[PDB]
């Protein structure tokens, strides 16, 4: 149930990171996931390479 449990480099283990002030905007992870999935889908629909 620990939603905010994350890697604590300073402590050296696993602890809540909201106490470590490690936060990022939602439109970084969301954008990365969306663009990466789209790129993977684009790559998967390729079956040949042609030299011009």
């Amino acid at each position: 149930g620990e939603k905010t449990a994350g890697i604590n480099v300073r402590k050296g283990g696993i602890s809540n990171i909201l106490e470590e002030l490690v936060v990022q905007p939602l439109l970084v992870s969301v954008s990365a996931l969306t663009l990466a999935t789209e790129t993977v889908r684009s790559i998967l629909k390729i079956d040949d390479v042609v030299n011009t």
């Binding site: 939603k3 002030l21 490690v22 936060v23 990022q24 905007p25 939602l26 992870s29 969301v30 996931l33 969306t34 999935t37 993977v40 889908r41 998967l44 629909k45």
Partner: protein, 52 residues
């Protein structure tokens, strides 16, 4: 996945479904933030600069 005999089209559709589910999950974890809160902005900037 491909070595298992899966066509590279079911993979794409399943990845799209996983992307939609993950976007919903990330939106669930989100927390509203106001620009008048200087502490959150400072924490975000510090987190961005931590890796440089």
């Amino acid at each position: 996945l491909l070595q298992k005999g899966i066509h590279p089209t079911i993979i794409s559709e399943s990845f799209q479904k996983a992307l939609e589910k993950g976007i919903e999950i990330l939106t669930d974890m989100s927390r509203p933030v106001e620009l008048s809160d200087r502490e959150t902005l400072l924490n975000s900037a510090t987190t961005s600069l931590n890796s440089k």
